[PDB]
From a paper:
In our new structure, the CBM is ordered and bound to the N-terminal lobe of the kinase domain. The interface between these two domains generates the binding cavity for 991. One end of the five stranded β-sheet that constitutes the core of the N-terminal domain of the kinase packs against a pair of anti-parallel β-strands from the CBM. 991 sits in a pocket generated at this interface and interacts with hydrophobic residues from each domain, mainly involving ring-1 and ring-2 of the activator. Interestingly, the phosphorylated serine (pSer) at position 108 from the CBM is involved in a network of electrostatic interactions with Lys-31(Kinase) and potentially Thr-21(Kinase) and Asn-111(CBM). Mutations of Lys-29(Kinase)/Lys-31(Kinase), Arg-83(CBM) and Ser-108(CBM) all lead to more than a 25-fold reduction in activator affinity, without altering the regulation of AMPK by AMP. An α-helix immediately C-terminal to the CBM, absent in previous crystal structures of the CBM38 and just outside of the CBM consensus sequence, interacts with the αC helix of the kinase (hereafter, the C-interacting helix). However, the top of the C-helix is rotated away from the active site, relative to our earlier structure, such that the Lys-45->Glu-64 interaction is broken (which is regarded as essential for efficient phosphoryl transfer). Thus, by promoting this CBM/Kinase/regulatory–fragment interaction, 991 and A-769662 enhance protection of the activation loop against dephosphorylation.
AMP-activated protein kinase (AMPK) plays an important role in regulating energy homeostasis in eukaryotic cells. AMPK is a heterotrimeric enzyme complex composed of a catalytic α-subunit, together with β- and γ-regulatory subunits. The α-subunit contains an N-terminal protein kinase domain and a C-terminal regulatory domain. The γ-subunit contains four copies of a cystathionine-β-synthase domain27, and we previously showed that the γ-subunit binds three molecules of adenine nucleotide.
Residue numbers in the entry:
A (entry chain F): 27 to 121, 128 to 270, 276 to 325
B (entry chain C): 10 to 284, 327 to 346, 363 to 373, 396 to 473, 532 to 551
C (entry chain D): 78 to 170, 189A, 190A, 191A, 192A, 193A, 194A, 203 to 270
Write the structure that this text describes.
C-alpha cells in the first residue's frame, strides 16, 4: 500500500552511506588474486572494469568462486590449474551488466533486483560514469525499517506467515551434516539458492551453510580439499529460525536485527517446513 | 552632512584589516548601523578584486546569531559601502581589560557562543583566520559577535592554504612557520588562546621579542594557573596542541564536559532545539548505518584474515634523489605518454591527457613535497562515456609505471 | 545614486564647486584629515574642483581638463555599472614541454589503514577530511599488480574506490 508509494519517492542515493569503500577489479587481473582481494578488503563483491573498451562489464561475487571450484576440481592430490592461471577476462569466456542510477527510485531498485534475479546491484552515476555503491536486499529492507513508524502500519504486517503465503515451502535444498563441500557447491550451482540448511540424521537443522561461508576456503587456503564435510568447513565459526504463526512484522524485525538474508521456517521442533528469504519479502512488498 | 542611502555617517569605529569602519545613524529614526568603507582603487591596485567578490557572496548568505549580519552593500563610482549590524558593547578585548578576568560561568557562555559562530563558518567552507578578542564584539546583552573577516578564505576539496596571516599571537604554530594548513585547526588554535585570555586575563604565549615569541609558540609550552580546575585545563591543552593532528576538533570540544555544562541547545546543528527535515533526523540518528565506528557482535559479513601481515597504503610515490632530477625525470616521462601540461610552479604541474576511446580530456595535478630530511614525495591529485575516477587511476598508473 | 567627493589634502576649510553647484562653494564635512561630501549625480561626465583656504585647486590623482583658458578642473565619469556591486567588481577586474614545500601531515592520515571495529558493515568507512579528497594512495607492487585508491565526493557522500590493475 503506502510502502510501495514510499519506494517510488526516495532515490537510491538515500541508501548510499556517507563514507564507504568500493573495490574494483580490472578484467585482466588473475582470478585467484581477485578472490584473495575480496578477503583482504572485507568486501563481498566487486565491479569489473574492462580497460580496453573503457566501461564496467559486470560483478565478481563469491558465486563465481563457487562456479570455478565446482567446474574444475579433480582431487585433493592435484591442484586446480585454472583457478591458479585463469584471468577474470578468460573465465568470463568459459562461463550484460545490470546497474542503476543514483537518481533512480527505490522502487526501480527492488524491481531490477528481482527481474534479473540478482543479489547485488551496482549504483553507477550516469553523469561521471563512476560507480558509487552496491545495493543489496539487506540494505534496502534495513532502510525501510527506519520508516515503519513514519509511514505507519499497513494491515498485512499483523498477518501470520501462513496466511500471507510468503516464501518457498516445497523442494527445499538441504545438505547432510556429513555432506562433502564439493557436493554442497554442486547444489549451489544446480538450484541457485543462497544458503543450505545443514541437517542431522534426526532431521533437525544443526547449522546453516551460506554462500558466504565459501570464501573461508579462500581465506584459510583450504580450497584444494573439497572432500571435507560441510561441518568441517563451518568449524571455524562453531541458527535463526521462525514459525508459520508469527506475524510478518516480527519476521522483518528478526531479519533486520540479525542482518542475515533468510530465516528457516520450522515446524513444532527443529525440522524444516520452508524458507522465508529477503528476496521473498521485497517481492511481496512490490507486487501490491 | 554626509549621507549614504538614508544613513548619516559619523565617527570612525575603527579600521579593520581591510577598510575603514564608521558608525551610521538613520536620518529619520536614529537606527544605528556600522559601515565598512572599501576604496575601489585600492581594491583594484591589489589582486583582491576577486577576493572581495567571494567575501560578499558569502557574508550575504550568513545568518548566525553570533556573527555580524550584513544588511546591504552600496556601490559608488569610487567606494563600496557595506552596511552591517551595529553593536554598542564594544570589543571583548576591552571587556577582559575592564574586569580582571572573566568568571567561568560567563566565560563558558561566551566561549560557547564564539565556537558556535566558528563552526557555522567551517560548515560553510569559510575559515576566519583573524580570531581574537579584538575581533569579537559585544552587544547590549553580552552576546559575542564575530566580525572583520578580511583575512578569511574558502576551503576547497583536496586543497591546502598557504597564507601566513593574523596577529603574531593567537596564530597557530604552522601559520607562523609558513607551512601549508587545512584551515579549521588553525581557528581552533585561536579559540584556545581566546579562552585562555578569557579565563586568565593574559596571553599563553607572549614576549616583547618577536623571534622569541615564535619560539614559545612552536614550543607549545604555556603556564596553567592553579585557579584553573582540572577539567578546563585538559581542554586548553587539547586545543593548543602543537601537532595539528593531535589538536582537538569542534566535535572534540563539543564532547568535553566543561563545554557541555550549561550549554544552550539552540547553538549546535544536532542539539535537540536546533531543527524532509524529519527524513534527515531519522538518517542522522542512524550513525552506524551511514558511518563506520572505531575500536561486541561481529558483523555477519566480516572477512577472516587471509595469518599474513596486512599491507600498508602510502601517499603517492617517493624518492631520495635531487629535487631537480625528479622533475627532470617526470618531464621525460610525460613525453613517452604524450602529456600536455602547464607549469604553475617549479614543483607543481597541471597535466592533461586526451582519452583516445571516449574523446574526453583527463587532467590531474602533480606536486612534489618534502618529507623528513633526505626524502621527497610526488603527490597525485584529480581535477574536475567511461568513468572519471577510472580515468584518473589509469592515467596515474601509466605515469607511475614509466617512472623508474 | 550617490557619488563620493573626498579631499585628502590639507586645509582648515574645503569647499566643492562643480557644474552641479553652478560653480558655487559647497562646505565639506571634516573628520580627522578627510573632507568629504556625498551627492546624488546622474549618469555621464561631471566637472568639479575644490576650494581650499581661499585658493582654487584640484586633486592631482584625478582626471583633469583644460577649458582653453587655463582653468583646470577634475573629471569624474559616473557610469551605470558603478551602482551595482558585482557589476563594479567585474569592470575593476600552455602545452609546453619545459624547463619544495613541506608535506602537510593531514595527507599522512591514510583512510584505508584504520580499523572500523567488527560491529558494522565492512564496506563502511570514517568520514574523510575534506583536504585528503582527490589524492592518490597506493600499495607496494606485488607480483605485477598495482593497486591504486582515492577518496572522491558525490553530492554529500564520499566513496573510496580501489583499483586492482595488473601492469
Ligand atoms: C584605511 C582606509 C580605508 C578606506 C579608505 O577609502 C575611503 N575613506 C573614506 C572616508 C569617507 C568619509 C570621510 C569623512 C567623513 C565620513 C563620514 C563623516 N565624515 C566627516 C566618511 C568616505 Cl565618504 C569614503 C572613503 N573611502 C581610505 C583609507 C585610508 O588609507 O585612510
Ligand atoms: N549487476 C549485475 N550485472 C551482471 N551480472 C550480475 C550482476 N549481479 C550479479 N551478477 C551475476 O550473477 C552471479 C551471481 O551472483 P549473485 O547475484 O550475488 O548471486 C554473479 O557471479 C554474476 O555473474
Ligand atoms: N535452501 C533452499 N531451498 C529451496 N529454496 C530456497 C532455499 N533458500 C532460498 N530459497 C528460495 O530461493 C529464492 C531466492 O532466495 P535467495 O537466494 O535467498 O535470494 C526464494 O524464493 C527462496 O525462498
Ligand atoms: N538463518 C540463519 N541462521 C544462522 N546463521 C545465518 C542464517 N542466515 C545467514 N547466516 C549466516 O550469516 C552470514 C552471512 O550470510 P548471508 O546472510 O547469506 O549473507 C553467514 O555466516 C551465514 O552462515
Amino acid at each position: 500500500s503506502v510502502y510501495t508509494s514510499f519506494m517510488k519517492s526516495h532515490r537510491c542515493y538515500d541508501l548510499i552511506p556517507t563514507s564507504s569503500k568500493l573495490v574494483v577489479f580490472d578484467t585482466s587481473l588473475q582470478v585467484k588474486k581477485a578472490f584473495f582481494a575480496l578477503v583482504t578488503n572485507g568486501v563481498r563483491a566487486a565491479p569489473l572494469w574492462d580497460s580496453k573498451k573503457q566501461s564496467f562489464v559486470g560483478m565478481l561475487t563469491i558465486t563465481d568462486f563457487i562456479n570455478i571450484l565446482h567446474r574444475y576440481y579433480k582431487s585433493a592430490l592435484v591442484q586446480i590449474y585454472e583457478l591458479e592461471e585463469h584471468k577474470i577476462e578468460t573465465w568470463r569466456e568459459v562461463y550484460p551488466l545490470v546497474c542503476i542510477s543514483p537518481n533512480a527510485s527505490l522502487f526501480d531498485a527492488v524491481s531490477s533486483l528481482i527481474r534479473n534475479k540478482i543479489h547485488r546491484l551496482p549504483v553507477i552515476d550516469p553523469e561521471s560514469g563512476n560507480t558509487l555503491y552496491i545495493l543489496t536486499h539487506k540494505r534496502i529492507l534495513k532502510f525501510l525499517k527506519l520508516f515503519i513508524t513514519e509511514f505507519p502500519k499497513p494491515e498485512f504486517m499483523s498477518k501470520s506467515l501462513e496466511e500471507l503465503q510468503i516464501g518457498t515451502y516445497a523442494n527445499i535444498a538441504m545438505v547432510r551434516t556429513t555432506t562433502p563441500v564439493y557436493v554442497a557447491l554442486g547444489i549451489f550451482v544446480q538450484h541457485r539458492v543462497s544458503a543450505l540448511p545443514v541437517v542431522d540424521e534426526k532431521g533437525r537443522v544443526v547449522d546453516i551453510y551460506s554462500k558466504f561461508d565459501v570464501i573461508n576456503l579462500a581465506a584459510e587456503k583450504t580450497y584444494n580439499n573439497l572432500d571435507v564435510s560441510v561441518t568441517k568447513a563451518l568449524q571455524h565459526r562453531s541458527v535463526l529460525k521462525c514459525y508459520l504463526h508469527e506475524t510478518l512484522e516480527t519476521i522483518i524485525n528478526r531479519l533486520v536485527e540479525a542482518e542475515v538474508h533468510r530465516l528457516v521456517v520450522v515446524d513444532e521442533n527443529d525440522v524444516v517446513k520452508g524458507i522465508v528469504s529477503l528476496s521473498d519479502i521485497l517481492q511481496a512488498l512490490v507486487l501490491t | 552632512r554626509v549621507k549614504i542611502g538614508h544613513y548619516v555617517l559619523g565617527d570612525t569605529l575603527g579600521v579593520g584589516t581591510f577598510g575603514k569602519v564608521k558608525i551610521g545613524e538613520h536620518q529619520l529614526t536614529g537606527h544605528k548601523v556600522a559601515v565598512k568603507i572599501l576604496n575601489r582603487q585600492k581594491i583594484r591596485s591589489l589582486d583582491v578584486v576577486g577576493k572581495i567578490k567571494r567575501e560578499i557572496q558569502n557574508l550575504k548568505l550568513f545568518r548566525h546569531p553570533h556573527i555580524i549580519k550584513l544588511y546591504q552593500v552600496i556601490s559608488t563610482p569610487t567606494d563600496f559601502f557595506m552596511v552591517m549590524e551595529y553593536v554598542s558593547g564594544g570589543e571583548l578585548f576591552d571587556y577582559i581589560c575592564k574586569h580582571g578576568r572573566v568568571e567561568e560561568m560567563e566565560a563558558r557562555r561566551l566561549f560557547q557562543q564564539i565556537l558556535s559562530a566558528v563552526d557555522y563558518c567551517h560548515r560553510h567552507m569559510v575559515v576566519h583566520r583573524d580570531l581574537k578578542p579584538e575581533n569579537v564584539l559585544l552587544d547590549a546583552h553580552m552576546n559575542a559577535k564575530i566580525a572583520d573577516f578580511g583575512l578569511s578564505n574558502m576551503m576547497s576539496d583536496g586543497e591546502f592554504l598557504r597564507t601566513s596571516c593574523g596577529s603574531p599571537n593567537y596564530a597557530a604554530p604552522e601559520v607562523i612557520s609558513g607551512r601549508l594548513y587545512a584551515g579549521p585547526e588553525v581557528d581552533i588554535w585561536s579559540c584556545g588562546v581566546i579562552l585562555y585570555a578569557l579565563l586568565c586575563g593574559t596571553l599563553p604565549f607572549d614576549d616583547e621579542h618577536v623571534p622569541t615569541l615564535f619560539k614559545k609558540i612552536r614550543g607549545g609550552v604555556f603556564y596553567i594557573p592553579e585557579y584553573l580546575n582540572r577539567s578546563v585545563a585538559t581542554l586548553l591543552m587539547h586545543m593548543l596542541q602543537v601537532d595539528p593532528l593531535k589538536r582537538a576538533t569542534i566535535k572534540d570540544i563539543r564532547e568535553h564536559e566543561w563545554f557541555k555544562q550549561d550549554l544552550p541547545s539552540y547553538l549546535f546543528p544536532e542539539d535537540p532545539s536546533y531543527d524532509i527535515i524529519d527524513n534527515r533526523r531519522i538518517m542522522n540518528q542512524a550513525s552506524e548505518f551511514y558511518l563506520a565506528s572505531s575500536p561486541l557482535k561481529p558483523h555477519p559479513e566480516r572477512m577472516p584474515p587471509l595469518a599474513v601481515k596486512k599491507a600498508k597504503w602510502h601517499l603517492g610515490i617517493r624518492s631520495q634523489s635531487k629535487p631537480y632530477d625528479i622533475m627532470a625525470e617526470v618531464y621525460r616521462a610525460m613525453k613517452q605518454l604524450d602529456f600536455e601540461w602547464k607549469v604553475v610552479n617549479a614543483y607543481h604541474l597541471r597535466v592533461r591527457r586526451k582519452n583516445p576511446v571516449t574523446g574526453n580530456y583527463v587532467k590531474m595535478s602533480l606536486q612534489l613535497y618534502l618529507v623528513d630530511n633526505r626524502s621527497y614525495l610526488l603527490d597525485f591529485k584529480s581535477i574536475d562515456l567511461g568513468s572519471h575516477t577510472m580515468d584518473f587511476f589509469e592515467m596515474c598508473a601509466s605515469l607511475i609505471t614509466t617512472l623508474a | 545614486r550617490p557619488t563620493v567627493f573626498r579631499w585628502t589634502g590639507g586645509g582648515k576649510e574645503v569647499y566643492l564647486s562643480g557644474s552641479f553647484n553652478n560653480w558655487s562653494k559647497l562646505p565639506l564635512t571634516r573628520s580627522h584629515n578627510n573632507f568629504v561630501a556625498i551627492l546624488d549625480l546622474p549618469e555621464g561626465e561631471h566637472q568639479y574642483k575644490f576650494f581650499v583656504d581661499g585658493q582654487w585647486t584640484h586633486d592631482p590623482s584625478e582626471p583633469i581638463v583644460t577649458s582653453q583658458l587655463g582653468t583646470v578642473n577634475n573629471i569624474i565619469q559616473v557610469k551605470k555599472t558603478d551602482f551595482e556591486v558585482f557589476d563594479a567588481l567585474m569592470v575593476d577586474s600552455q602545452e609546453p614541454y619545459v624547463c619544495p614545500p613541506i608535506l602537510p601531515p593531514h595527507l599522512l592520515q591514510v583512510i584505508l589503514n584504520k580499523d572500523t571495529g567488527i560491529s558494522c558493515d565492512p564496506a563502511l568507512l570514517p568520514e574523510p577530511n575534506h583536504v585528503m579528497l582527490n589524492h592518490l594512495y597506493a600499495l607496494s607492487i606485488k607480483d605485477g599488480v598495482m593497486v591504486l585508491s582515492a577518496t572522491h565526493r558525490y553530492k554529500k557522500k564520499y566513496v573510496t574506490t580501489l583499483l586492482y590493475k595488473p601492469i
